[PDB]
Design a protein around this ligand. Sequence first.
Ligand SMILES: C[C@H](NC(=O)[C@@H](Cc1ccccc1)NS(=O)(=O)Cc1ccccc1)C(=O)NCc1ccc(C(=N)N)cc1
Ligand SMILES: *[C@@H]1O[C@H](CO)[C@@H](O)[C@H](O)[C@H]1NC(C)=O
Ligand code: NA
Ligand code: NA
Lengths: 251, 11, 28
Amino acid sequence: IVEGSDAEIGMSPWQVMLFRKSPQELLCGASLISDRWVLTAAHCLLYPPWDKNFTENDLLVRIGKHSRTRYERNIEKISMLEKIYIHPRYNWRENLDRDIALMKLKKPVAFSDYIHPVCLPDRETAASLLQAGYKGRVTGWGNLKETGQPSVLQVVNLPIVERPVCKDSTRIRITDNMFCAGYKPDEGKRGDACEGDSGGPFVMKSPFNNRWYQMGIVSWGEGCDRDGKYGFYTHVFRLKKWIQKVIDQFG
Amino acid sequence: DFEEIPEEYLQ
Amino acid sequence: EADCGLRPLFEKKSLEDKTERELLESYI
Ligand SMILES: C[C@H](NC(=O)[C@@H](Cc1ccccc1)NS(=O)(=O)Cc1ccccc1)C(=O)NCc1ccc(C(=N)N)cc1
Ligand SMILES: *[C@@H]1O[C@H](CO)[C@@H](O)[C@H](O)[C@H]1NC(C)=O
Ligand code: NA
Ligand code: NA
């Protein structure tokens, strides 16, 4: 996260760290959506241009974390993966269209002050909140700058951007399964996700029922926090039918 | 840079 | 889950975090 701040304790209890076993390192962010299911970006698990293709046993899920590097004894919980599910029409060849994957845990994780699932949006909540100017919140342990790494979880609030502005900021083909967020050059304020934040949640707090909803997944961007560029996010509601299909069949 | 995690999670 | 999106250390105890008001103010 570039130009964000330290998270408060328990601020984002759905935040998940995807952790590579060997070598031990941060792979991606992710989110807890039930006691057995974790949501992330497909490109965190599968991206052939970078020779990335992780299998279940390559990875661990670390939940309830604040510190990036510490083993947070008695606070974090570490889970093994039973199965990875990548969207069947995830487009890794071109533009990361449908950049979404589910991971089922081998065992349910115990909820605590630091560990709690986020809501997934219904159509109405999506329609109400996914509007240009409305702000969401992105969290992660990724890079503090495009070109180091934070001591603890970082947070930044960013406005959703008009789709034509998103489209005009890039040569990459944008789809309805994406949205973009971030400040314009003229708006003064700054902030963006960056590498390492991939797969983490873009969340919004519904003013109707005061619950947090995950509207987006950190997906891609050209550099980090560049003037005139925006962060792009997987549109979670647009792919919720797939999410529900996987959980209904395998959960 | 990462602190070692308990061996039980790596077996 | 019926309890999703409600944080034990914030919503569950009616405490607000330091910047969630920024989000609310953006929701017209
Ligand atoms: C695979 C994907 N590729 C990209 O995002 C490409 C564009 C892209 C998009 C879709 C298909 C192919 C390429 N842009 S990049 O090459 O500038 C990524 C990058 C950023 C900083 C340092 C190093 C690399 C990737 O890295 N995704 C991770 C990511 C997530 C968020 C941001 C952000 N600024 N909000 C940036 C990068
Ligand atoms: C990724 O790895 C699996 C095996 O674990 C393989 O079957 C699959 O074809 C690979 N997908 C690629 C290279 O796109
Ligand atoms: Na364009
Ligand atoms: Na920018």
